[PDB]
Design a protein around this nucleic acid. Structure first.
Ligand SMILES: [Mg+2]
Ligand SMILES: [Mg+2]
Ligand SMILES: [Mg+2]
Ligand SMILES: [Mg+2]
Ligand SMILES: [Mg+2]
Ligand SMILES: [Mg+2]
Ligand SMILES: [Mg+2]
Ligand SMILES: [Mg+2]
Ligand SMILES: [Mg+2]
Ligand SMILES: [Mg+2]
Ligand SMILES: [Mg+2]
Ligand SMILES: [Mg+2]
Ligand SMILES: [Mg+2]
Ligand SMILES: [Mg+2]
Ligand SMILES: [Mg+2]
Ligand SMILES: [Mg+2]
Ligand SMILES: [Mg+2]
Ligand SMILES: [Mg+2]
Ligand SMILES: [Mg+2]
Ligand SMILES: [Mg+2]
Ligand SMILES: [Mg+2]
Ligand SMILES: [Mg+2]
Lengths: 67, 96, 217, 223, 60
RNA sequence: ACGGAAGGGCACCACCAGGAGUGGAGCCUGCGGCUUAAUUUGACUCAACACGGGGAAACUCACCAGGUCCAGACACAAUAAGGAUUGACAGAUUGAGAGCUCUUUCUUGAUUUUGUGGGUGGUGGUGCAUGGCCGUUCUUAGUUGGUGGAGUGAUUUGUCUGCUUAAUUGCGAUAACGAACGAGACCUUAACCUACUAAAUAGUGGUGCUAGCAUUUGCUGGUUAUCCACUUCUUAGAGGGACUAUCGGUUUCAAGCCGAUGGAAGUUUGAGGCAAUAACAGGUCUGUGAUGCCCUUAGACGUUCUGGGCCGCACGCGCGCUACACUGACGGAGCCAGCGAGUCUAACCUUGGCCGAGAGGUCUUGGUAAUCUUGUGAAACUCCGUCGUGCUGGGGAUAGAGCAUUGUAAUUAUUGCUCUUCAACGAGGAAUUCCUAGUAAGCGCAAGUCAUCAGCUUGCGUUGAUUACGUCCCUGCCCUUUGUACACACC
């Protein structure tokens, strides 16, 4: 199954907190934003982050998310 | 090792004219690469030698590396000629 | 350089606290071992033991070292530190740290005639670290510390000149004997003699006096 | 001449291994770490990295000359078309081989099992590494053989970066009774990588934003 | 892709596990048309360990 | 640690739903047993038995019957230039052009011989003295600090009820907070790219020159460069690409699971590489000029040479191969792969021409290779025809006779060919192995081995499904609960 790891989610929270205005609900733009404000050592990882970060946004923007 | 001296000469001439020996672990070879005597000779000619100093022995990938020490070249200056090589000088380059 | 992380250490780093009795008086804890470091240098340290313990892992075995350290000047202050770690050296160091954050005050007193500077104990005290109990009794001058080698070193660094020891229980488990020897002389400042009957008016604790110089970022 | 490229590059890789083995035997007492090899338009350059270059580049061209002539005879090089060079080292504390052989010699020079271990460990660690692990197997206190592990710092073991950052060396040490094994492992610092990635393939770094005092009320500047 | 496939084990005990090594040989060519100075310069100015180089005359 | 106790989970080396079989037959092949001059030897439940890359005619080669050789270094000491010592034609003698031994008599010169010391070798023992490597627990998910909490202490918590996941994977619950190893990331390989950079060792369109059917312009070929243009197909550099996207149903409306839409791709995208801590007297001294100790070292356990043996056959066992046919066999005919390999001081891949029923032969050729073999025209398969259920033309064992190839050497048949002999086998008892998508199964092919020999293995692609999309009933494991008089830990 598809469970995102700590290093992933750990990054998403970290990104979101200090970049909420800069980020959107769209995967591809966010994906790009990662190349600027973060230095990720591989593409799959970077997308995976960009993907979960975009996931939280799409529910953050529907009510405050626990952490 | 038995062997004649006219074969035992060329070995000791080569062991100083070049100062080092190719060797290779292969008995029954008949004739070295350079040295026109048995490869068995050259080996057991330099097994007596290193067993009494003079030259050092090194074995890797089925190849002895026969290197002549200090006390060696003095066993040569009595066994060959003069008193005044190879491993001492000669600087190549085609100079052209 | 030591960079304080507790309210206490700041006042100690700054110079707004100059002696340890200030802390014992206000019963403040102590969490940064540098506090007592500054407050009390030349505090000699003897390690008394290193026995190995063993464990059983989800497979075979697991073996590692245990250090017991006492620290003190020899003028009223002592510490006992038990630490066990993966190597000798580190198991020791940590012990010394843990011995110092442990450091305790001692009411030394006269056996009888108060002619010139205490030599034994205020009163009889006793402590018990599981089964082992050590008892300390005041003693004439010249009497010396009458204890087992390991209790004597402890009481030495505690700055004691003479005392009598009765000891009970399995005093072969070195760790427990000492911890009671410790609980013993630490209790000397609990025993309310009639000279402490006088009423004082309670100091106000350097935490409020130097409150500003105790505040952080 | 005239050899299949498939066979040549292999045949070459053979040569490297045959050289590297040799030089490890002869030049062990000089702290030999490794060699490069360079085919050039004429001249072939055998480059010897060793932490004791003088006992290699010997008595004014000697010693290394033996070592050249020992080569021209082996692989049938016409003299001069092959030339042995000499390097020092890139800090022996970071090379497993130079360390491996150090445990060998130290143990050979009679030293103590645990001391030899930690002393190597602490040299690597104080050579700016990220970690070090030295594992001695064999007969330590005789009879039934055991194995001891002396590690300090940080290691990984898993995927690719094991090949990037950590290099190991197993060396056979011949002892009074049997033999022991010397497996030194040295994980270097990705922070200094230079050639390759500068972090673990999962190190996420986030550049910190900036406090802002917004409003300012529109306005505009002209030039 | 050179392929060497053998058993991990020496002797012959244990599960029948296999390993497979590779050597990857990469090739390419570039064609030039240049004379006296540009020919001997370019063979040697462009040189690098591990990289086998070879230049060809022409015709047959 | 264990348990013939409890609760949870996970796993086609577990079962459910099934597929394919194996166990029955013959042959191949390994193991035992037996036999033998020897039938060398390792290994014995998963984790010994087409394993030791163990397909052995010499070799290998360790075993059996016999014959040589020193390559017994150096050092001390003794004989010896009234010659230490070496060699050999002949004959006798021997499998033998071994001068090994002997008959005669020449030779050759300090290099050898004798002895003690000391050494060199050994596929001789010891894997229960080791290393190195490897198998296994492990298709598993586990391991460990710092600071704080608990306990005299060993310890404990952190490392968890629940839910989630392939995962100590995560949400969360939280006397813990924050982290490192393992898992994940990572790497490889396979899928998409009309976007970039390119191409006579990759292709394509046009153009010359030329062939044929048609002739209404056309359709189909030939031409290694006729000449030009390009990069779709091929190759490989640089990047792009997916994140489980988007919507929807569930759920602490959390991790996540499910569905539908698109998408090259939505099972960790598929498949591998790597892989922590700790452990086992698991295998290997017969891989090693890796190695302790013992053993032996010139009537040698060293080495080499001649021949035999490892394959010897009342029988037990395992891996296989070929089959019982009509969804087939045989004969024609159609004709499509991918992974691969290949000759320098050498005889490897071999087209083509001729010869030969065949196997194979002979003269040439290209290729150190995206260039020559080779579009590796592979088999399954497809069409048409013959056979017509009969141990039949299914099946091809056993055996006779002959021709060729490898090799010094084919007998105890190396292999290949041709004719003839035409066995058991009519679906395989009790049992039992393997598997979830280009998979299973069927099909062959290259590569390892290799002088010759694959019924073995490592990979490759061709044809291509039924059944599941689950559970703990069986069998293993894992965590937790629990008992213990175990700790050399239920051998
Ligand atoms: Mg009692
Ligand atoms: Mg990791
Ligand atoms: Mg991994
Ligand atoms: Mg079933
Ligand atoms: Mg069957
Ligand atoms: Mg059968
Ligand atoms: Mg044989
Ligand atoms: Mg033989
Ligand atoms: Mg032998
Ligand atoms: Mg063992
Ligand atoms: Mg974890
Ligand atoms: Mg072209
Ligand atoms: Mg054309
Ligand atoms: Mg669809
Ligand atoms: Mg063997
Ligand atoms: Mg056999
Ligand atoms: Mg038939
Ligand atoms: Mg047919
Ligand atoms: Mg019939
Ligand atoms: Mg085989
Ligand atoms: Mg219990
Ligand atoms: Mg218990």
């Amino acid at each position: 199954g598809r469970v995102r790891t700590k290093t992933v989610k750990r990054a998403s929270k970290a990104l979101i907190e200090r970049y909420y205005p800069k980020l959107t609900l769209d995967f591809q733009t966010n994906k790009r934003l990662c190349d600027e404000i973060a230095t990720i050592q591989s593409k799959r990882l970077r997308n995976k982050i960009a993907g979960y970060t975009t996931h939280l946004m799409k529910r953050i923007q529907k009510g405050p998310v626990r952490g | 090792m038995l062997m004649p001296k006219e074969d035992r000469n060329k070995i000791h001439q080569y062991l100083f004219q070049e100062g080092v020996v190719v060797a290779k672990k292969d008995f029954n070879q008949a004739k070295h690469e350079e040295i026109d005597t048995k490869n068995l000779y050259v080996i057991k000619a330099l097994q007596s030698l290193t067993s009494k100093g003079y030259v050092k022995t090194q074995f890797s990938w089925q190849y002895y590396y026969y290197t002549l020490t200090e006390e060696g070249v003095e066993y040569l200056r009595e066994y060959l000629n003069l008193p005044e090589x190879x491993x001492x000088x000669x600087x190549x380059x085609x100079x052209x | 350089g030591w960079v304080p992380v507790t309210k206490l250490g700041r006042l100690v780093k700054a110079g707004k606290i100059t002696t340890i009795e200030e802390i014992f008086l206000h019963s403040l804890p102590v969490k940064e071992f540098q506090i007592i470091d500054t407050l009390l240098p030349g505090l000699q340290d003897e390690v008394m033991n290193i026995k190995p313990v063993q464990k059983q892992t989800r497979a075979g075995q697991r073996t590692r070292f245990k250090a017991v350290v006492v620290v003190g000047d020899s003028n009223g202050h002592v510490g006992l530190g038990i630490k066990t770690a993966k190597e000798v050296a580190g198991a020791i160091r940590a012990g010394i740290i843990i011995a110092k954050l442990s450091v305790i005050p001692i009411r030394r007193g006269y056996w009888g005639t108060n002619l010139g500077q205490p030599h034994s104990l205020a009163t009889k005290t006793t402590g018990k670290c599981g089964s082992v109990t050590v008892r300390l009794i005041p003693a004439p001058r010249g009497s010396g510390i009458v204890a087992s080698p390991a209790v004597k070193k402890l009481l030495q660094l505690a700055g004691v000149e003479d005392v009598y020891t009765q000891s009970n229980g399995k005093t072969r488990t070195l760790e427990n004997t000492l911890k009671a020897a410790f609980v013993a002389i630490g209790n000397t400042y609990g025993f309310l003699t009639p000279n402490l009957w006088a009423e004082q008016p309670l100091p106000v604790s350097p935490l409020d006096i130097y409150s500003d110089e105790a505040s952080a970022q | 001449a005239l050899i299949s490229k498939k066979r040549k590059l292999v045949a070459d890789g053979v040569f490297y291994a045959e050289l590297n083995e040799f030089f490890t035997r002869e030049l062990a007492e000089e702290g030999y770490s490794g060699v490069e090899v360079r085919v050039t338009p004429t001249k072939t350059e055998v480059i010897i990295r060793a932490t004791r270059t003088q006992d290699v580049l010997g008595e004014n061209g000697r010693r290394i000359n033996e070592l050249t002539l020992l080569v021209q005879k082996r692989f049938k090089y016409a003299p001069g078309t092959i030339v042995l060079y000499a390097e020092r080292v890139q800090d022996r504390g970071l090379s497993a081989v130079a360390q491996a052989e150090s445990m060998k010699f130290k143990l050979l020079n009679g030293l103590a099992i645990r001391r030899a271990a930690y002393g190597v460990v602490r040299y690597v660690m104080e050579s700016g590494a990220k970690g070090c692990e030295v594992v001695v197997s064999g007969k330590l206190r005789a009879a039934r053989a055991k194995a001891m592990k002396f590690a300090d710092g940080f290691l990984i073991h898993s995927g690719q970066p094991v090949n990037d950052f950590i290099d190991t060396a197993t060396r056979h040490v011949l002892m009074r009774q049997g033999v022991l094994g010397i497996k030194v492992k040295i994980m270097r610092d990705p922070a200094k990588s230079r050639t390759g990635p500068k972090a673990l393939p999962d190190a996420v770094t986030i550049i910190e934003p900036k406090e802002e005092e917004p409003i300012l009320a529109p306005s505009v500047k002209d030039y | 892709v050179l392929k060497i496939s053998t058993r991990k084990t020496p002797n012959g005990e244990g599960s029948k596990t296999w390993e497979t090594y590779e050597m990857r040989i990469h090739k390419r060519y570039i064609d030039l048309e240049a004379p006296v100075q540009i020919v001997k310069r370019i063979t040697q100015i462009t040189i690098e360990p591990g990289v086998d180089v070879e230049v060809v005359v022409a015709s047959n």
